[PDB]
Design a binder for this molecule. Structure first.
Ligand SMILES: *[C@@H]1O[C@H](CO)[C@@H](O[C@@H]2O[C@H](CO)[C@@H](O)[C@H](O)[C@H]2NC(C)=O)[C@H](O)[C@H]1NC(C)=O
Ligand SMILES: *[C@@H]1O[C@H](CO)[C@@H](O)[C@H](O)[C@H]1NC(C)=O
Ligand SMILES: *[C@@H]1O[C@H](CO)[C@@H](O)[C@H](O)[C@H]1NC(C)=O
Ligand SMILES: *[C@@H]1O[C@H](CO)[C@@H](O)[C@H](O)[C@H]1NC(C)=O
Ligand SMILES: *[C@@H]1O[C@H](CO)[C@@H](O)[C@H](O)[C@H]1NC(C)=O
Length: 188
């Protein structure tokens, strides 16, 4: 909705250079290519829609976004075990109510046959590292802090995500999240 230089924020000066040098641990020069985030990000019961994207990056304020796929879809909800802000819901179902998901209690949200995984957003890096997701029809990569985790799942991803940025009060009404979707093969 509104563009923002992501490197001009506080604590986000080196959140990108710390990401392009994750795997390059040698001395010298090299040109790399991939779905790498750019400098201009997007700070903006509200919804946002990204289409034709291959990766999704972003940087206790709550956020929610749903990655569409068949026959399994992914829900990431950052808001209950102690110091476990984030939740991953591997929904095998189709359309899901994004309001009843957040308004209801955390004890019964991702229930039924849907897999629930509570993960700890590290509240000690002061939001100075990129959080991200990347997917193809064979592998799903998650970037949290400075490490990459892989999952092997055979899915049919639709390359679009649904994002919730505004709602009424596990949800505190605030806007402290920047996000971006990557669709082109960028070189650094
Ligand atoms: C994400 O993309 C998928 C795949 O294109 C969309 O699913 C199709 O949506 C169209 C309308 O745009 C329907 O006519 C098709 O029947 C849908 N196909 C399937 C297999 O579901 C989906 O709507 C997109 N979602 C968002 C939120 O943009
Ligand atoms: C980013 O900063 C440059 C100057 O460094 C400015 O011209 C540009 O408009 C900014 N882009 C934004 C705010 O989207
Ligand atoms: C995060 O901020 C705290 C509070 O100022 C500081 O003690 C800590 O070292 C910071 N962590 C970093 C810079 O990795
Ligand atoms: C995004 O912009 C809004 C509206 O101007 C502002 O309140 C908010 O602080 C910005 N968010 C960040 C993380 O900079
Ligand atoms: C991706 O690059 C093409 C040219 O290769 C350009 O036309 C298109 O607008 C780019 N897409 C985005 C989302 O920036």
């Amino acid at each position: 909705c509104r563009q923002v230089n992501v490197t001009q924020l506080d604590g986000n000066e080196n959140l990108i250079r710390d990401f392009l040098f994750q795997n390059f641990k040698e001395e010298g020069t090299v040109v790399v290519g991939g779905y790498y985030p750019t400098e201009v990000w997007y700070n903006c019961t509200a919804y946002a829609y990204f289409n034709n994207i291959h990766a999704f990056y972003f940087d206790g304020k709550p956020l929610l976004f749903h990655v569409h796929g068949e026959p399994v879809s992914v829900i990431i909800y950052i808001s209950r075990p102690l110091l476990k802000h984030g939740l991953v819901c591997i929904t095998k179902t189709r359309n899901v109510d994004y309001n009843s998901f957040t308004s209801s209690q955390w004890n019964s949200i991702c229930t039924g046959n849907d897999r629930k995984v509570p993960f700890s957003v590290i509240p000690t890096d002061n939001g100075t590292k990129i959080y991200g997701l990347e997917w193809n029809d064979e592998l799903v990569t998650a970037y949290i802090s400075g490490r990459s985790y892989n999952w092997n799942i055979n899915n049919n991803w639709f390359n679009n995500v649904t994002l919730m940025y505004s709602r009424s009060s596990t949800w505190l009404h605030s806007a402290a999240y920047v996000y971006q979707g990557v669709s082109n093969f960028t070189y650094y």
